[PDB]
Amino acid sequence: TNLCPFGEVFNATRFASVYAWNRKRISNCVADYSVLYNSASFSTFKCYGVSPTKLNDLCFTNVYADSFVIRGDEVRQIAPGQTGKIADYNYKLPDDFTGCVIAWNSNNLDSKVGGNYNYLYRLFRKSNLKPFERDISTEIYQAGSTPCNGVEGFNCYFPLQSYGFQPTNGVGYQPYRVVVLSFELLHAPATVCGP
Amino acid sequence: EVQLVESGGGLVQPGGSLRLSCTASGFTFSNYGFHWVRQAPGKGLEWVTIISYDGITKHYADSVKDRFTVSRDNSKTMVYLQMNNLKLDDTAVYYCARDLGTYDDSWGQGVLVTVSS
Amino acid sequence: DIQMTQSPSALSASVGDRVTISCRASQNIDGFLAWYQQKPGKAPKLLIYAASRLQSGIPSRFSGSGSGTDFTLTISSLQPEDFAAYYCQQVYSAPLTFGGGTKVEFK
């Protein structure tokens, strides 16, 4: 009567950074997705290619849970075929993606007076990220023609910029915990069906 | 293991100046903001000041505002609570904390500061 | 400024009893409340954060509830170790303010 560890993913004390997003493989277990929908504490529960209600019957071979914290504004960017700073350089969702994006406000969890430095979204990248590709590099960004040489300088900028998370910040700038569930339907064991 | 140790607490005269240095170890000092809390003898807790991770932002409670200055050195991993115009009321055990009331919360043992004439 | 009122300060109970400690914020602080337990001559230990989230390494008996201006701390079963001062501190505002203090005492 194996049960999928959704509680570990959803109720983790600290979520990972959006640039350094955490991917957890879920397999060989029964998952009650409907229980998550019934709680309804999530501001965003958008499912693409599948219906959020009644998806128990469908059987999924490979389920991946991706966890990161972003601003309220960026939640729209976490969708297929969306363009944004977060989409281009931090987390990319494929155009043909089938799965559910779950986001809830975590203002009371991920905020500190004077700002929290942990989240650190990527601000500069040479090229747009490929879908489901993670970059953790801290190499200096050569905006200028002159080489940085590995040191901060005029026209050379650190790639990662820290989100300033404050309790007083507006809902758009407030932290949001986002879990993206990726479902694969193929000819395979389909162990994590979750009826 | 995150460790905070308070030093520099000692006997002082009223109107004297004392500085308390909060040594930190086991974590990245720059990433986390720091707080100072004082418990007066036979009294409840009283938050004193905050210094942000960047260090530009500093906030002080009125009872110590314009008399206490909070500073930090990232290289030395020490937070300094400069105290000036000390008073008999100021006498307390001063605790240095990291990110109060959050998952990153940590507390030092505390150092007793005594103001006596 | 935000002001925290912690009642009942003089609460007493025997071992195994259910204890409740109520903290009231003067103005809305969302879920930004923390609960601390201070034993005599010891640094405060953070039992609860974010109003209801238990800190790691804290016993499960401690629990928190409430949002907005009203909050509560509940101990399901009292223990000898639990007989200590309890404090509620808001973290929403830039100047943090602690509560008065509640001393759970053996009956």
Q: How far is CA C102 from the centre of its chain?
A: 8
Question: Could you give the CA distance from residue A14 to residue A118 in angstroms, rounded to a whole number?
Answer: 10
Residue closest to A79 by CA, chosen among A56, A62, A102: A102
In this complex, do C53 and A111 lie within 8 Å of one another by their Cβ atoms? no
Contact A43, A159 (CB under 8 A): no
Same domain, residue pair A56 and A149: no
In this structure, the number of other CB atoms found within 10 A of the CB of residue B80 comes to 19
Residue A25: Cβ-neighbour burial (10 angstroms; 0-12, 13-18, 19+): exposed
Contact A32, A194 (CB under 8 A): yes
Nearest Cβ partner for A167 among C30, C51, C56: C30
3-class state of residue A72 by DSSP: helix
Question: Could you give the CA distance from residue C58 to residue C50 in angstroms, rounded to a whole number?
Answer: 15
3-class state of residue A8 by DSSP: helix
In this complex, do C91 and A109 lie within 8 Å of one another by their Cβ atoms? no
Residue closest to A29 by CA, chosen among A50, A55, A72, A59: A59
Same domain, residue pair A21 and A31: yes
Number of domains in chain A: 2
- What does the block give as tokens for A192? 């994590």
Residue B90, phi then psi, degrees to nearest 5:
-65, -20
Cis peptide before C8 (omega within 30 of 0): yes
Number of domains in chain C: 1
Q: A148 is in which domain, residue-wise? A: 115-166
Same domain, residue pair A109 and A187: yes
Sheet holding A175-184, edge to edge: A22-26, A62-71, A175-184, A99-105, A44-48
In this structure, the number of other CB atoms found within 10 A of the CB of residue C88 comes to 29
Residues 48-77 of B with CB under 8 A from A: 50-54, 57, 59
Residue closest to B35 by CA, chosen among A142, A114, C10, A24: A114
Residues 31-70 of B with CB under 8 A from C: 35, 37, 39, 44-47, 50, 59-62
Same domain, residue pair A16 and A55: yes
| C55: nearest CA partner in chain B | B103
Residue closest to A92 by CA, chosen among A61, A127, A40: A127
Residue closest to A176 by CA, chosen among A100, A79, A93, A109: A109
Nearest Cβ partner for C50 among A108, A113, A168: A108
Same domain, residue pair A19 and A81: yes
Does domain B3-110 bear CATH number 2.60.40.10? Answer: yes
Give chains near A: 3+ CB pairs under 8 A: B, C
CB contacts, 8 Å: A109 with chain B: 103
CB contacts, 8 Å: B52 with chain A: 113-115
Strand B11-12 to strand B111-115: parallel, antiparallel, or no bridges (unpaired)? parallel
CB contacts, 8 Å: A112 with chain C: 91
Report DSSP state, residue A117.
Answer: -
The method of structure determination was cryo-EM
Residues 1-30 of A with CB under 8 A from B: 13-14
| Resolution of the experimental model, in Å, one decimal | 2.8
Residues 56-75 of A with CB under 8 A from C: none
Residue A39, phi then psi, degrees to nearest 5:
-60, -40
In this structure, the number of other CB atoms found within 10 A of the CB of residue A65 comes to 21
Residue C103, phi then psi, degrees to nearest 5:
-105, 100
Q: Which amino acid, one-letter code, is at A98?
A: T
Same domain, residue pair A45 and A78: yes
Question: Could you give the CA distance from residue B79 to residue B100 in angstroms, rounded to a whole number?
Answer: 15
Same domain, residue pair A40 and A126: no
3-class state of residue A158 by DSSP: coil
- Cβ-proximal residues to B1 (8 Å cutoff; 6+ apart), any chain: B26
In this complex, do C44 and B95 lie within 8 Å of one another by their Cβ atoms? yes
List C-alpha distances in Å: A34 to A78, A97, A178, A193.
Answer: 22, 20, 18, 13
The CATH number for C48's domain is 2.60.40.10
Give chains near C: 3+ CB pairs under 8 A: A, B
Strand A121-122 to strand A99-105: parallel, antiparallel, or no bridges (unpaired)? unpaired
Same domain, residue pair A158 and A66: no
Give chains near B: 3+ CB pairs under 8 A: A, C
| C95: nearest CA partner in chain B | B61
Contact A134, A64 (CB under 8 A): no
Backbone conformation region of residue A54, classed left if phi is above 0, alpha if psi is from -120 to 50, else beta: left
